[PDB]
Design a protein around this motif. Sequence first.
Motif, PDB file in Angstrom:
ATOM      1  N   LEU A 126      -8.183   1.453 -98.963  1.00  0.00           N
ATOM      2  CA  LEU A 126      -7.574   0.367 -98.186  1.00  0.00           C
ATOM      3  C   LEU A 126      -7.173   0.882 -96.809  1.00  0.00           C
ATOM      4  CD1 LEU A 126      -7.105  -2.688 -98.806  1.00  0.00           C
ATOM      5  CD2 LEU A 126      -4.708  -2.022 -99.289  1.00  0.00           C
TER       6      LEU A 126
ATOM      7  N   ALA B 213      -8.540  -0.374 -93.107  1.00  0.00           N
ATOM      8  CA  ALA B 213      -7.567  -0.932 -92.144  1.00  0.00           C
ATOM      9  C   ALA B 213      -7.775  -0.470 -90.711  1.00  0.00           C
ATOM     10  CB  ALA B 213      -6.152  -0.607 -92.607  1.00  0.00           C
TER      11      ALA B 213
ATOM     12  N   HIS C 166      -5.616  -5.271 -94.230  1.00  0.00           N
ATOM     13  CA  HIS C 166      -5.691  -4.070 -95.031  1.00  0.00           C
ATOM     14  C   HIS C 166      -4.570  -3.088 -94.904  1.00  0.00           C
ATOM     15  CE1 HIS C 166      -9.771  -5.675 -94.467  1.00  0.00           C
ATOM     16  NE2 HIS C 166      -9.690  -5.583 -95.805  1.00  0.00           N
TER      17      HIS C 166
ATOM     18  N   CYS D 184      -9.400  -4.376-104.027  1.00  0.00           N
ATOM     19  CA  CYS D 184     -10.142  -5.185-103.054  1.00  0.00           C
ATOM     20  C   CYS D 184     -10.452  -6.581-103.614  1.00  0.00           C
ATOM     21  CB  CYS D 184     -11.516  -4.551-102.730  1.00  0.00           C
ATOM     22  SG  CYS D 184     -11.487  -2.758-102.583  1.00  0.00           S
TER      23      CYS D 184
END
Length: 568
Positions: free
Chosen positions: A43, A47, A58, A68
């Motif tokens: 994640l 991001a 994210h 996800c």
Amino acid sequence: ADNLAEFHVQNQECDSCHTPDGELSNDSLTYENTQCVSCHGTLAEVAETTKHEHYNAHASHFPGEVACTSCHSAHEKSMVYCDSCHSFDFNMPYAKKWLRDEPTIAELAKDKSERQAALASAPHDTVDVVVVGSGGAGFSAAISATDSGAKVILIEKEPVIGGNAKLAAGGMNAAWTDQQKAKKITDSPELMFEDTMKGGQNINDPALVKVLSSHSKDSVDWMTAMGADLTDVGMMGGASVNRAHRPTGGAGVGAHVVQVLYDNAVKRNIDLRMNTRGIEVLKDDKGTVKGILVKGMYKGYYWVKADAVILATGGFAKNNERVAKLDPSLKGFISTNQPGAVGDGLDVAENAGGALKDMQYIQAHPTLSVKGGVMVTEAVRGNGAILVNREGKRFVNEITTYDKASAAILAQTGKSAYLIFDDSVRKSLSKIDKYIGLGVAPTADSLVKLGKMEGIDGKALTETVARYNSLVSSGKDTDFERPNLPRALNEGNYYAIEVTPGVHHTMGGVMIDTKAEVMNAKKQVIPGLYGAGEVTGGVHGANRLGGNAISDIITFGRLAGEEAAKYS
Ligand SMILES: Cc1cc2nc3c(=O)[nH]c(=O)nc-3n(C[C@H](O)[C@@H](O)[C@@H](O)COP(=O)(O)OP(=O)(O)OC[C@H]3O[C@@H](n4cnc5c(N)ncnc54)[C@H](O)[C@@H]3O)c2cc1C
Ligand code: HEM
Ligand code: HEM
Ligand code: HEM
Ligand code: HEM
Ligand SMILES: O=C(O)/C=C/C(=O)O
Ligand code: NA
């Protein structure tokens, strides 16, 4: 492509995401999410490619490891979880508008025809205790049980953990702590008990409030030994002294505590199942629990055989239809809660024979941001901010009870008011920077200018702040009698936040005793069934105090887990 799978299968095989036999690994989609990570990164790595100045799909405040598939489904379009509270400018591939439409427990009677097959099968698992709900109470009880030697399974109906607990800001109330002593505060479990009963209008079950005050330092010590930082002690309404514990500098207590409990559950290898809803407590021929039927989003209905079930499902303040039946004055209000805080856990407790109490007592938080639609912590007032109306004046004691603060705000011109503070308040509570980051705290170097931006009478605001600052320096508020006046509003720039009430906490719920055992209407214990946290009634009586719910879920969750383990 019409959907994400179809887009990827243009260049990839089914087994780029699926297991060798093709069957879904489990209801958390553990294997399948590992594959997304395999190619796109974690994640945090995703991001870095989706940055916006003040927000990022994210990289958010949610604790734990957000799957996800929480937002990206494969074979159908899916929804952005953030849309359930915010309206950020997003462009997720294959999105559809946020809509929560979850059948009630009563409506699931339509699946009679698959429930009977589940129940006629062998149990899918055989464990000692099943905990329902991954908020503060549920993680606390899962850890406690496991630490005591019981094998647990912890289920969560939502795709992400934390319930409403992860959103908490103000603090965790406790008395006589080492943390208080370090800040030079003098307090006691008897004053916390006294403040609480008075704040709950003496409707609180006294034996439950005694467990609340007497286990409070213990709970704080327990969290801190697990890794929590509860060393900032602030003031919240209706407390005689500062006792609201939170991380250093005044960050949010909520996301922090839930991140610590998840990290600890992961270290004990606790079986945690996402997208798995508890549906029906199962009882044997003498009425004692023998297990629970669950509905897995991806795997269907199955049952777990177990000696105990602990319901830790939270309140029903997001369900305005149920709220409005019990309190017609709150119909139509926005909520501060997560989308699944609808009361289905209460319905499970009732079908099992548990009785409810204090259901008519529903709390509205007085200060939701008009602009962001999200709660603004009562800690902003506790650290020194005042409230002003459109005419530029004070109109209430800002640390009065939630009921009285909401009514006074609603009585103002426009049904809203403004929090007003300076850089001295801003720097004392880091959570304020989060409101500034959301865009909901306009600022100017003079009150004259600030009122001109927000439509507040500028020269009357300037006079109001000068008068409040001379009351602070005197030591007594003779205009509204606010009993704590911690700082003058005079350093650097000024800020305003437009605020109004919203539905927040349900103080009633299932009836429990001091061991967290669920009882029926005749006050008979239902053996093997436990309740902890906002799903229970009797702890907070008619009005909960800021900071007392985080104290409640840790204490009662911990205790339900130990008693279930022992019952066995
Ligand atoms: C925005 C906000 C800020 C707050 N700040 C504070 C604070 O600073 N101090 C304070 O004292 N209180 C605070 N409160 C209240 C406090 O956060 C709580 O009342 C909440 O943490 C109670 O925790 P819980 O574990 O009982 O429930 P929750 O944390 O809500 O968790 C319960 C879980 O059960 C899951 N679940 C529900 N039904 C089922 C079912 N049938 N099957 C499967 N899973 C199920 C839900 O989805 C949820 O994740 C705040 C509340 C909010 C909303
Ligand atoms: C369910 C699991 C997955 C999720 C949630 C996910 C997420 C996404 C998303 C949102 C897109 C953009 C789609 C578009 O632009 O229309 C995408 C594209 C892409 N995905 Fe996935 N993905 C997953 C699995 C995988 C796997 C297993 C692989 C590799 C085998 C992969 C490799 C790629 C590639 C190569 C692209 C195109 C752009 C790029 O070069 O990164 N994804 N993915
Ligand atoms: C043609 C190739 C594929 C086939 C035949 C296939 C098959 C299936 C089937 C039958 C299901 C439902 C099973 C059940 O309900 O038990 C499912 C779900 C799922 N599949 Fe696929 N799959 C394919 C490609 C993919 C790809 C490319 C991805 C990821 C990019 C993926 C990820 C998932 C996920 C995450 C689920 C759970 C439900 C959902 O999100 O839609 N699959 N798949
Ligand atoms: C590691 C887990 C995840 C993966 C691999 C993944 C994958 C992706 C990819 C490849 C994109 C396209 C953007 C780009 O890089 O050009 C994307 C966009 C997006 N994803 Fe995810 N995602 C994940 C988790 C999530 C979660 C949990 C949420 C919601 C809480 C979410 C919501 C979105 C949104 C809203 C967009 C569009 C962003 C924007 O317009 O700024 N994703 N995702
Ligand atoms: C992955 C999902 C989400 C994302 C990316 C997101 C993003 C943000 C952002 C950018 C802010 C401004 C402060 C900051 O930078 O942290 C914020 C604040 C806030 N959000 Fe979210 N949000 C999400 C989901 C939610 C949901 C579903 C709720 C309610 C259930 C919520 C409640 C709040 C609250 C109460 C605040 C105010 C400041 C605080 O308490 O920390 N958010 N969020
Ligand atoms: O941080 C808040 O304003 C809320 C605290 C609470 O409801 O206890
Ligand atoms: Na309750």
